[PDB]
């Protein structure tokens with residue numbers, strides 16, 4: 064019974080995630096470790112034209128009063144569907160090979176993913192909602208479509224002080240990307256709330272039970288993603304969420320509950336980050352594969368994906 | 377071990393689906409049968425404003441050259457996400473209660489759904505793609521997000537001659553809906569291809585194996601939904617689909633393979649249709665529930681959904 068190890072490096076953009084993972088896989092540790100990069104090519108060419116630029120341009124026009132929140136929201140929703148498509152399809156074809164968790168024993172193969180489907184289906188949409196370019200109903204429409212959490216989903220979020228983050232973000236300016244410190248703050252808050260949510264849920268938290276507290280290491284409901292959904296549009300006349308929206312939140316809980324989040328401190332040398340990531344890896348949960356041919360298949364998928372959609376390695 | 381029976385009435389709009397199901401449940405056959413209506417209220421108010429009107433207006437403007445395919449596509453994608461949200465969240469909270477299939481023995485509860493998630497996540501998006509208001513990349517982004525097919529998914533599609541269909545469609549004109557015989561033809565073709573796809577796959581069809589035939593009761597690849605994806609935008613320089621798109625098609629197959637489709641002939645009296653549906657029901661696959669409290673819960677969900685989102689019964 065060979066084991067597989069999957070690690071998802073996520074968190075706000077411009078933090079050193081791409082740099083640190085490339086160093087991690089740069090150790091040339093044979094085939095037992097494959098890195099899956101961001102589908103930059105899908106975003107810029109295959110899925111639609113310059114989607115990242117479309118996003119930043121759209122937020123800007125909205126900020127300058129050149130378009131309405133309505134038009135911003137519609138373009139943003141469509142852009143986010145394009146951003147997460149390759150993440151969703153990969154997770155979807157990978158599901159049939161993931162078996163139960165096998166504790167924490169060298170894994171036959173290790174996959175280092177650059178971001179998890181939730182970045183495009185939950186984290187960015189939620190952040191844009193805070194920026195006024197997305198509606199709460201849309202964010203929840205994405206939440207309701209988050210694929211079931213597979214066993215062994217180890218997500219590595221990041222930690223870096225705002226000032227040191229801004230500096231890094233200022234250096235790395237992607238194609239069609241515009242510096243937006245507001246968006247940066249919004250995304251930083253969303254990811255923090257996410258981490259608090261996993262914790263909150265794992266400590267026996269039940270959002271339905273704590274909801275009233277909102278009205279007015281132990282996170283409370285007010286420090287979780289659930290706060291973002293006290294929006295007036297979602298509240299029924301009796302001051303309670305419409306059931307459709309309540310169910311979506313139920314699904315959100317079901318999805319985040321079974322994830323293993325790890326916090327990597329990016330406030331150090333790139334090599335140092337690589338080491339800490341490598342170290343952190345030892346404590347991550349592994350899983351068994353459903354077929355003997357699964358390992359080779361999974362390795363091929365990852366290689367193909369990287370080759371066809373990676374802007375580079 | 378109590379069994380549950382789930383029936384999804386789907387197919388092109390304006391065929392008598394709403395009429396026939398209401399008659400079916402109008403028999404007052406106690407609690408053993410609950411009807412889940414279309415979330416008309418979510419579409420018109422809760423999710424966004426007059427979404428159906430938004431769709432028909434948008435296609436029209438595009439047909440009159442008042443907007444570009446690009447702008448049509450963006451609004452349409454966003455509208456479809458709103459259309460299917462309540463379908464997706466319901467299926468998502470219902471999943472934890474559905475156990476394995478129990479043959480074809482009176483079911484403790486029967487659920488008659490008005491449409492299946494695939495109508496909003498696959499069928500309409502594909503039809504709009506044919507109408508020029510949606511891109512193939514977007515349709516596949518929806519395909520990749522279709523939730524895993526639960527056991528006991530009995531889908532009842534419809535059969536009605538075009539002329540008799542048009543007449544019915546001409547009578548029933550929903551709020552903000554515009555008569556579009558082109559859209560009608562496109563949706564009729566999509567649903568037909570769908571039925572052929574389930575059949576094709578169940579007879580041991582493998583799209584990857586038959587793909588080349590496209591280049592140039594036993595359906596061939598050319599009579600299935602796979603034909604719609606020979607779009608130039610999806611084809612790589614070597615004349616083959618980009619892997620991302622090929623995988624999406626893989627997921628499409630995995631999803632449709634395990635569905636039980638039944639064809640109901642609407643070319644008859646409403647009572648007659650009700651009888652035929654009722655009759656057809658006897659041969660549908662049932663399933664076991666995962667907990668004893670599942671039946672009551674499932675019954676409550678359905679009742680709540682209908683009450684909160686049904687424009688009426």
Ligand SMILES: Nc1ncnc2c1ncn2[C@@H]1O[C@H](COP(=O)(O)OP(=O)(O)O)[C@@H](O)[C@H]1O
Nearest residue numbers: 076077078079080081082231234235331332333
């Ligand atoms: N340990 C580090 N210290 C300082 N800057 C770093 C460090 N690691 C990466 N960077 C960088 O900061 C910028 C953003 O890094 P990158 O890895 O590309 O971001 P992202 O988190 O978005 O994947 C790059 O210019 C890169 O030089």
Ligand SMILES: Nc1ncnc2c1ncn2[C@@H]1O[C@H](COP(=O)(O)OP(=O)(O)O)[C@@H](O)[C@H]1O
Nearest residue numbers: 389390391392393394395544547548644645646
């Ligand atoms: N058996 C039938 N014969 C003729 N017309 C019918 C029949 N059943 C329903 N209709 C109708 O045709 C129109 C559309 O029916 P409806 O059930 O509302 O459509 P849908 O398929 O979209 O749910 C309605 O005006 C209704 O009267």
Ligand SMILES: Cc1cn([C@H]2C[C@H](O)[C@@H](COP(=O)(O)O)O2)c(=O)[nH]c1=O
Nearest residue numbers: 075076077101115118146182183187240
């Ligand atoms: C995943 C994702 C990234 N982005 C943006 C953030 C960055 O500006 C850009 C690339 O992110 P990165 O710096 O982490 O590689 O893509 C979105 O706008 N939406 C998304 O869903």
Ligand SMILES: Cc1cn([C@H]2C[C@H](O)[C@@H](COP(=O)(O)O)O2)c(=O)[nH]c1=O
Nearest residue numbers: 388389390414428431459495496500553
């Ligand atoms: C489910 C669905 C319906 N529709 C339209 C078809 C009809 O005009 C209208 C209601 O459909 P109905 O007649 O079947 O009840 O909604 C979409 O445009 N997209 C969808 O995803």
